[PDB]
């Protein structure tokens, strides 16, 4: 059993990859940079391992497959769809926008079915049940 | 441009005579360093790429630093290096000379902090080659000396300097090697000792030999080496891949 990473931390890293890849850096050099700029070890550690698969010649989608607990099937398939169609840059931009919307939506239920769904049923009928 | 790189098949285009190209072929084999000078769009880069491409470079480690790709070479032992964000030309040359290049090609010297590394590479005894924007000898030398290489280091370690031109006669578009053997420096001087091997007469569109003798290009470690140069002198298919393929042999 392994967990994913925080909504914040997926966000930062998907943004910064989308940014570097759309800059025309090589994918492996993009990977190196975000690992080397990371503050949490678990991120720098994974991203070295994702990069290690990319330097063996695997796609980014197949390299992220080593962390299925962090990048779900829907994420990889978006990457792999971008790689198959020659649009890796624009699907990473999409994924970065997705991850940003996901983190913002998380903070913002919780502040004051996942946790958001269970907490949102639970808040929507609490009062009317009291009543 | 239009490219895919011009070859020595360009004695078709009357630019350089076959004899001179053999002399350069020789020259490049024993690692005489050369700079191609010329005003803007006289053919510097093309000619350079032609001279490297025409040689068999399959047995030597060659080694190029450019601000962007322009150089195509049909050769295996070759490291191609391109300036990236925040790197000076000197970073790549400085770290490259570091390995073991038999031949170093600098796209064009424009920060002379790299120029300096280049002529340093010439004095260790590499075969260095590059391009420079200028139209004659005060043009270059001035241009080379103004970020701090001396003419003893450049002229003393630079072997040959070709000068390229565009000649127009109404609608012909002609690119010719207008002309230069750098002998060395002089103690107490004017410095740059230059022996002009070939000039180009535009009036007849001809390349003349102007006081060059066989005793000049002797510079050989010996008899057998010098003999090899002579044979290539007179003894030594348009595509680059095939041409390289046939200089290789």
């Amino acid at each position: 059993g392994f967990g994913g990473v925080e909504g914040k931390d997926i966000l930062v890293f998907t943004r910064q990859f989308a940014t570097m890849i759309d800059a025309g850096l090589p994918l492996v050099q993009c990977l190196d940079i975000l690992a080397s700029q990371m503050d949490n070890p678990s991120f720098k550690k994974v991203l070295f391992a994702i990069k290690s698969k990319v330097e063996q010649g695997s796609t980014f989608a197949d390299a992220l497959k080593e962390h299925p607990k962090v990048f779900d099937e829907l994420y990889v398939q978006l990457c792999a769809a971008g790689e198959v169609g020659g649009i890796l840059d624009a699907i990473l931009n999409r994924l970065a926008a997705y991850r940003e919307k996901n983190e913002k939506l998380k903070s913002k239920v919780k502040s004051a079915l996942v946790a958001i769904g269970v907490t949102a049923v639970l808040l929507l009928k609490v009062t009317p049940v009291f009543e | 441009l239009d490219k895919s790189n011009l070859q020595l098949d360009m004695t078709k285009l009357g630019f350089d005579a076959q004899p001179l190209a053999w002399f350069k072929e020789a020259i490049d084999r024993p690692y005489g360093m050369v700079l191609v000078t010329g005003p803007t769009g006289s053919g510097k880069t093309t000619t350079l790429y032609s001279a490297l491409s025409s040689l068999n470079g399959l047995d030597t480690n060659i080694c190029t630093a450019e601000d962007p790709v322009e150089f195509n070479f049909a050769g295996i032992n070759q490291v191609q290096m391109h300036d990236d964000i925040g790197l000076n030309f000197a970073a790549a040359l400085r770290s490259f000379l570091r390995q073991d290049p038999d031949i170093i090609m600098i796209g064009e010297i424009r920060d002379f902090e790299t120029a300096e590394i280049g002529v340093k590479a010439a004095l260790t005894g590499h075969l260095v080659l590059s391009t420079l924007h200028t139209n004659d000898a005060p043009g270059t030398v001035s241009r080379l000396l103004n970020m701090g290489i001396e003419p003893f280091l450049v002229t003393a370690s630079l072997n040959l300097i070709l000068a390229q031109r565009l000649a127009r006669r109404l609608c012909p578009a002609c690119k010719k090697p207008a002309e230069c053997r750098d002998c060395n420096d002089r103690g107490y001087r004017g410095r740059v000792a230059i022996y002009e091997v070939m000039p180009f007469w535009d009036g007849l569109k001809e390349l003349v030999i102007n006081g060059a003798s066989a005793a000049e290009l002797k510079q050989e470690a010996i008899r057998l080496g010098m003999s090899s140069l002579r044979m290539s002198g007179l003894r030594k298919a348009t595509t680059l891949e095939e041409v390289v393929g046939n200089t290789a042999p």
Binding site: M20, L25, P26, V28, Q29, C30, L31, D32, I33, A35, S36, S52, K53, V54, E55, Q56, G57, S58 | D59, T60, N61, V69, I76, N77, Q78, V79, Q80, M81, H82, D83, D84, L87, A91, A92, S95, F96, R98, Q99, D100, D102
Partner: protein, 203 residues
């Protein structure tokens, strides 16, 4: 990797090992056998690029597809250079007893991956060298992009530095335990080296 039946690979001692530039890289022990080659051409429908390999190395790769290694890797007490090589080695042997319960002395590869001029210019380019007597010669050693990248980090790290897309060129020195040095130039990715990552070593 993909072949026809595993049985056919083992019988003919051949193994596909990649697909590049519309061609199937096929490692083959008997490249003079036109029957086997034409069988592979017909069964795959793919144009082949033949690479000769030692028979037992091909067989080994067929059966593996580097496992015993995939586990001995997760042993931090091995890579650690702070530990004397004399002892480190011992751990690798005893740890290898896990599979079959002996000590293997001298696993060539298991050691080869844990413990005058070399020119490594790009991806899928045969290495060149300068021999003490023969000078510039081509070599039977090539690495595709993944292997290149891995070498490249290996050499970089042993020399004490961290090459990356942020710092793509690297001019360090390896200290062989025998006090012997070597100058290493090195480049990751293709950002400065379009022909891919690359390294040179002046011993």
């Amino acid at each position: 990797i993909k072949l026809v039946p595993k049985e056919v690979a083992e019988k003919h001692l051949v193994v596909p090992v990649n697909r590049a530039g519309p061609s199937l890289i096929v490692a083959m022990c008997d490249p003079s056998n036109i029957f086997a080659v034409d069988d592979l051409k017909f069964l795959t429908g793919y144009n082949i690029e033949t690479v000769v390999a030692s028979e037992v190395s091909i067989r080994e790769a067929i059966e593996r597809y580097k496992g015993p290694s995939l586990e001995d890797i997760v042993g931090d007490v091995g890579d650690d250079i702070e530990v004397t090589k004399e002892e480190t080695e011992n751990i690798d042997e005893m740890a290898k007893a896990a599979d079959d319960a002996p000590v293997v002395k001298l696993v060539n590869l298991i050691l080869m991956d844990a413990i005058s001029d070399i020119h490594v210019e790009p991806y899928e380019k045969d290495f060149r060298v300068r021999f003490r007597i023969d000078g510039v010669m081509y070599e039977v050693m090539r690495p595709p992009m993944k292997l290149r990248n891995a070498i490249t980090s290996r050499l970089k790290i042993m020399a004490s530095l961290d090459i990356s897309e942020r710092r793509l060129p690297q001019d360090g020195r390896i200290k062989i335990k025998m006090g012997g040095g070597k100058e290493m130039d090195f480049r990751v990715s293709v950002c400065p080296t379009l022909f891919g990552e690359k390294v040179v070593m002046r011993l």
